[PDB]
Scaffold this active site. Structure first.
Site, mmCIF file in Angstrom:
data_model
loop_
_atom_site.group_PDB
_atom_site.id
_atom_site.type_symbol
_atom_site.label_atom_id
_atom_site.label_comp_id
_atom_site.label_asym_id
_atom_site.label_seq_id
_atom_site.Cartn_x
_atom_site.Cartn_y
_atom_site.Cartn_z
ATOM 1 N N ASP A 153 40.313 47.503 63.298
ATOM 2 C CA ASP A 153 40.900 46.511 62.377
ATOM 3 C C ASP A 153 41.494 47.211 61.138
ATOM 4 O OD1 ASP A 153 41.603 43.880 61.387
ATOM 5 O OD2 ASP A 153 39.533 43.478 60.741
ATOM 6 N N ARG A 157 44.670 44.337 54.271
ATOM 7 C CA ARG A 157 43.616 43.466 53.754
ATOM 8 C C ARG A 157 42.214 44.136 53.757
ATOM 9 N NH1 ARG A 157 41.899 41.942 59.158
ATOM 10 N NH2 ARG A 157 43.865 42.274 60.296
ATOM 11 N N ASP A 174 36.233 47.690 54.910
ATOM 12 C CA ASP A 174 35.650 46.638 55.729
ATOM 13 C C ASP A 174 35.512 47.196 57.140
ATOM 14 O OD1 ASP A 174 35.222 43.433 55.831
ATOM 15 O OD2 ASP A 174 36.102 44.141 57.715
HETATM 16 C C1 LIG Z 1 36.349 44.570 39.901
HETATM 17 C C2 LIG Z 1 37.665 44.205 40.575
HETATM 18 C C3 LIG Z 1 37.520 43.870 42.050
HETATM 19 C C4 LIG Z 1 36.683 44.683 42.830
HETATM 20 C C5 LIG Z 1 36.512 44.394 44.186
HETATM 21 C C6 LIG Z 1 37.179 43.305 44.798
HETATM 22 C C7 LIG Z 1 38.032 42.504 43.993
HETATM 23 C C8 LIG Z 1 38.193 42.795 42.634
HETATM 24 N N1 LIG Z 1 39.056 41.992 41.816
HETATM 25 C C9 LIG Z 1 39.345 40.624 42.273
HETATM 26 C C10 LIG Z 1 39.937 39.901 41.049
HETATM 27 C C11 LIG Z 1 41.231 40.572 40.568
HETATM 28 N N2 LIG Z 1 41.724 39.798 39.383
HETATM 29 C C12 LIG Z 1 42.394 40.594 38.334
HETATM 30 C C13 LIG Z 1 42.829 39.668 37.198
HETATM 31 O O1 LIG Z 1 43.719 38.671 37.707
HETATM 32 C C14 LIG Z 1 43.105 37.848 38.698
HETATM 33 C C15 LIG Z 1 42.632 38.729 39.859
HETATM 34 C C16 LIG Z 1 40.968 42.054 40.298
HETATM 35 C C17 LIG Z 1 40.338 42.691 41.542
HETATM 36 C C18 LIG Z 1 37.038 42.946 46.222
HETATM 37 C C19 LIG Z 1 36.467 41.520 46.288
HETATM 38 C C20 LIG Z 1 38.372 43.013 46.958
HETATM 39 C C21 LIG Z 1 36.111 43.873 46.967
HETATM 40 N N3 LIG Z 1 35.778 43.783 48.286
HETATM 41 C C22 LIG Z 1 34.918 44.807 48.601
HETATM 42 C C23 LIG Z 1 34.303 45.190 49.788
HETATM 43 C C24 LIG Z 1 33.468 46.308 49.805
HETATM 44 C C25 LIG Z 1 32.892 46.653 50.936
HETATM 45 N N4 LIG Z 1 32.428 46.968 51.969
HETATM 46 C C26 LIG Z 1 33.252 47.034 48.613
HETATM 47 C C27 LIG Z 1 33.877 46.673 47.415
HETATM 48 C C28 LIG Z 1 34.701 45.537 47.429
HETATM 49 C C29 LIG Z 1 35.444 44.948 46.417
HETATM 50 C C30 LIG Z 1 35.596 45.274 44.978
HETATM 51 O O2 LIG Z 1 35.008 46.226 44.438
#
Ligand SMILES: CCc1cc2c(cc1N1CCC(N3CCOCC3)CC1)C(C)(C)c1[nH]c3cc(C#N)ccc3c1C2=O
Length: 298
Positions: A153, A157, A174
């Site tokens: 996969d 994303r 992932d």
């Molecule tokens: C602190 C930032 C962050 C960090 C992370 C994630 C999303 C974020 N943010 C979502 C919100 C945004 N904002 C910025 C301001 O405008 C609105 C959106 C800014 C990125 C997501 C949810 C994508 C994420 N999935 C993961 C899976 C696995 C595993 N295995 C490990 C880590 C992660 C993370 C993260 O560490």
């Protein structure tokens, strides 16, 4: 967990066997949740270490419990700079947590969409930024390939970034499909799958090469959906019949050629990840590639 304890599944990776007792249990009193980010992912801290926290709903099935354990085992055993690290787990308190490297840049697809050059941010991204992301993910995929692990996969994303700004590192973030297959349709990532996935259903690292080609298209299109305006079945019939995507807007020829080699019909004709890396590295050296302007989204 009694389900996790009674089943006590083993997980094998790179010739070594691990089980729940091998996971690094972080005392729950050391973990604080800060905010929701994205199942549920939270930003948290471990007493401090900034982490991402995946949670298991307390109302879940036995299968969900086992899935969650297998996800923990899978991520904990990887050791590579372009695969998200696992800090530990908290499986002895409810809801159950897995504690991961915080990736403040978020997911790659969303990053590409949000950071597209626009009249107000005409220089938000450059070709070199995209090649560095491609290299980073190719390095992770090469590690998986060398360790005989088929991801199944690879897609934008499923990639994560350490930060939004300059110096960001992309990582594979992932492993849900691999986890499901390890434990074992409208939900299949058809648009990332090679023709032979639909014939004999046989997976190899060459299936990940095909998916990486599609990831490269996603990167150089700045976060577009592959095969725009085709359904899954349309794409299946298209790719089977020899159909391939056109180059992304303004895509340099040498980059598009990496995509087209990844999408060779015969798996044996596709490059392995060491070759993909070499090609990406040559593109990064070529002034005419890296001086190519990305399109503005008006
Ligand atoms: C602190 C930032 C962050 C960090 C992370 C994630 C999303 C974020 N943010 C979502 C919100 C945004 N904002 C910025 C301001 O405008 C609105 C959106 C800014 C990125 C997501 C949810 C994508 C994420 N999935 C993961 C899976 C696995 C595993 N295995 C490990 C880590 C992660 C993370 C993260 O560490």
């Amino acid at each position: 967990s009694t389900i996790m304890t009674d089943y006590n599944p083993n997980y094998c990776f790179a010739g070594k066997t691990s089980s729940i007792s091998d996971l690094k249990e972080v005392p729950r009193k050391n973990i604080t949740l800060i905010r929701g980010l994205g199942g549920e992912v939270y930003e948290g801290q471990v007493s401090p270490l900034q982490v991402a926290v995946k949670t298991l709903p307390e109302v879940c099935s036995e299968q969900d419990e086992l899935d969650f354990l297998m996800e923990a085992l899978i991520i904990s055993k990887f050791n590579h700079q372009n695969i998200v690290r696992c800090i530990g787990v908290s499986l002895q308190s409810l809801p159950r947590f897995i504690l991961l490297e915080l990736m403040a840049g978020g997911d790659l697809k969303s990053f590409l969409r949000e950071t597209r050059p626009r009249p107000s941010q005409p220089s938000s991204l450059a070709m070199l930024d995209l090649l560095h992301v491609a290299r980073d993910i190719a390095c992770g995929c090469q590690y998986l390939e060398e360790n005989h692990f088929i991801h199944r996969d690879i897609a934008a994303r499923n990639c994560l970034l350490t930060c939004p700004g300059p110096g960001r590192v992309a990582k594979i973030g992932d492993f849900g499909m691999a986890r499901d297959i390890y434990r074992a349709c409208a939900m299949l990532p058809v648009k990332w799958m090679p023709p032979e996935a639909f014939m004999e259903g046989i997976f190899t690292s060459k299936t990940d090469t095909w998916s990486f080609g599609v990831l490269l298209w996603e990167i150089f299109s700045l976060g577009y959906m592959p095969y725009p305006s085709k359904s899954n079945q349309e794409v299946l019939e298209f790719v089977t019949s020899g159909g391939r995507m056109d180059p992304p807007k303004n895509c340099p020829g040498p980059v598009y050629r990496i995509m087209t080699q990844c999408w060779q019909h015969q798996p044996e004709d596709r490059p392995n990840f060491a070759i993909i890396l070499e090609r990406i590295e040559y593109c990064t050296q070529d002034p005419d590639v890296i001086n190519t302007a990305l399109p503005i989204e008006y």
